[PDB]
Amino acid sequence: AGRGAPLAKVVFRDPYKYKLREETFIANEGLHTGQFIYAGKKASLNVGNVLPLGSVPEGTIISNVEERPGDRGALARASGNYVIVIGHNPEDNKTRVRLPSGAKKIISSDARGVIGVVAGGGRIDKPLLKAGRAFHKYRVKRNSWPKTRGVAMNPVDHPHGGGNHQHIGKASTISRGAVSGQKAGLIAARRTGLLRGSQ
């Protein structure tokens, strides 16, 4: 509920007891019920299998990647997102990795990652239309919706507000070295206005 990702619940054995422990995995697009999954160093390269970054070739695709070893997941958990492996290092166990925003990062070689793209892709494509559809999205998340424009408010309630005409008055580009209360607008902006093509 309130998550762009269908989960998956896998049953593993306890090596030291006669018992079973279930773990909640994020399902990559390709999984199905009544399927085997192989997690470890010696595990093979298929969709669903969990491998450490060191035992994987260059140009592979993964998700639910750990920042450290033992983090239990962090990078690339959202819908239709995936991390690509670029480089390798023998000295210093540290692979090179590209994150879905664009900014690359060096991660340890023993860190994990589930193979394949995250399921439920193409969620953002359809428009919501009626406002009631947007209500039900935020109804099962937080209380962050019906946002009033700050310029429409009184000068007490917000900095932009006040005046006979609805205008801002002073520059919306606000510094990094500011304080809480002032920061309403574009915080530490390099560019402004309409950007063309290249991000």
Partner RNA sequence: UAAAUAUUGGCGAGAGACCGAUAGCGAACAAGUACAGUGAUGGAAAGAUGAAAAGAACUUUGAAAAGAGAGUGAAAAAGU
Partner RNA sequence: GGGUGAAGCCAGAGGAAACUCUGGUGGAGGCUCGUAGCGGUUCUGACGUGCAAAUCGAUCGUCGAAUUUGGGUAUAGGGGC
Partner RNA sequence: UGAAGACUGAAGUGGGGAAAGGUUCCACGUCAACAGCAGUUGGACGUGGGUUAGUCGAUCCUAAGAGAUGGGGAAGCUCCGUUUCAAAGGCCUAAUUUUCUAGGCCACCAUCGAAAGGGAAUCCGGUUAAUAUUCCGGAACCUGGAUAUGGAUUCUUCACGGUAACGUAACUGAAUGUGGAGACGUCGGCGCGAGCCCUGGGAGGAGUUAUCUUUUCUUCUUAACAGCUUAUCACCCCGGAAUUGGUUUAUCCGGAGAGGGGGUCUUAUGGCUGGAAGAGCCCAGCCCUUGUGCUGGGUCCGGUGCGCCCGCGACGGCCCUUGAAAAUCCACAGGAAGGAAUAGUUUUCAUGCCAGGUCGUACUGAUAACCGCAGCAGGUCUCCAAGGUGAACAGCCUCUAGUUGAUAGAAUAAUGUAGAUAAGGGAAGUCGGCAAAAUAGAUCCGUAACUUCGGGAUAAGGAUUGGCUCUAAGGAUCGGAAGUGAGGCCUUGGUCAGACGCGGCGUUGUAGACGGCCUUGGUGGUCUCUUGUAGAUCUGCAAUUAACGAUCAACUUAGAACUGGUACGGACAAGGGGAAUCUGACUGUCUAAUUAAAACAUAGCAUUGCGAUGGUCAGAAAGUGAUGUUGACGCAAUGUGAUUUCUG
Partner RNA sequence: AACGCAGCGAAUUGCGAUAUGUAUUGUGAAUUGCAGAUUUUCGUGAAUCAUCAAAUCUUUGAACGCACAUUGCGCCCUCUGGUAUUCCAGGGGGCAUGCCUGUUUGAGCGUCAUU
Nearer to RNA, 42 or 129 (CB): 129
Nearer to RNA, 3 or 40 (CB): 3
CB of 42 to RNA, least distance (A): 26
CB of 27 to RNA, least distance (A): 13
CB of 48 to RNA, least distance (A): 18
How far, in whole angstroms, is CA 149 from its chain's centroid? Answer: 28
Nearer to RNA, 46 or 139 (CB): 139
CB of 36 to RNA, least distance (A): 17
Nearer to RNA, 79 or 95 (CB): 79
d(CA 177, CA 106): 29
d(CA 189, CA 96): 29
d(CA 162, CA 152): 7
- Please enumerate in sequence order all residues whose Cβ is within 8 A of that of 59, keeping only pairs 6 or more positions apart, or say none: 84, 85, 86
